[PDB]
Design a protein around this ligand. Structure first.
Ligand SMILES: Nc1nc2ncccc2[nH]1
Length: 154
């Protein structure tokens, strides 16, 4: 019982784009851009669509970098998050009622204001490693258990 989500990191040689979510799921935290995959839509097409919706940016090729499954205790559905990165975008990041984008130098990624699991897998993304992870959460702040391994094929 899992539901598909996407997550896109615009990762350039010296900086990464994140968005401050203003409401709803994950509000108040910096995040990549993504959301639910639609009926009849490929995961990658969903990732490209959500990047545009949430950041205003157009991406062509997206590179698969990981899969992370999230369990929230007390919630039936697991989140099956397909993570992608890109270094070539078009457009300029757009602030909307839903998200405030902002570039971060790689040594200044705001982990204290991000979901706590990101501290584990972001360093792999930064070194161009691919991964499979699982995180069991209680609430939005507490990781009860996790696994995380590097893979050759996402
Ligand atoms: N970047 C990111 N980390 C997350 N952790 C748990 C749920 C959703 C998440 N999005």
């Amino acid at each position: 019982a899992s539901r598909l989500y996407t997550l896109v990191l615009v990762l350039q040689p010296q900086r990464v784009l994140l968005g401050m979510k203003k409401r709803g799921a994950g509000a108040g935290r910096w995040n990549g851009f993504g959301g639910k995959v639609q009926e009849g839509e490929t995961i990658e097409d969903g990732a490209r669509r959500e990047l545009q919706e949430e950041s205003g940016l157009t991406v062509d090729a997206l590179h698969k970098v990981g899969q992370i499954v999230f369990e929230f205790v007390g919630e039936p559905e697991l989140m099956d998050v397909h993570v992608f990165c890109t270094d070539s975008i078009q457009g300029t990041p757009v602030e909307s009622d839903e998200m405030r984008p902002c570039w971060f130098q790689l040594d200044q990624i705001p982990f204290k204001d991000m979901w706590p699991d990101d501290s584990y897998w972001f360093p792999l993304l930064l070194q161009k490693k691919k991964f499979h992870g699982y995180f069991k959460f209680q609430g939005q702040d507490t990781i009860l258990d996790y696994t995380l391994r590097e893979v050759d094929t996402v």
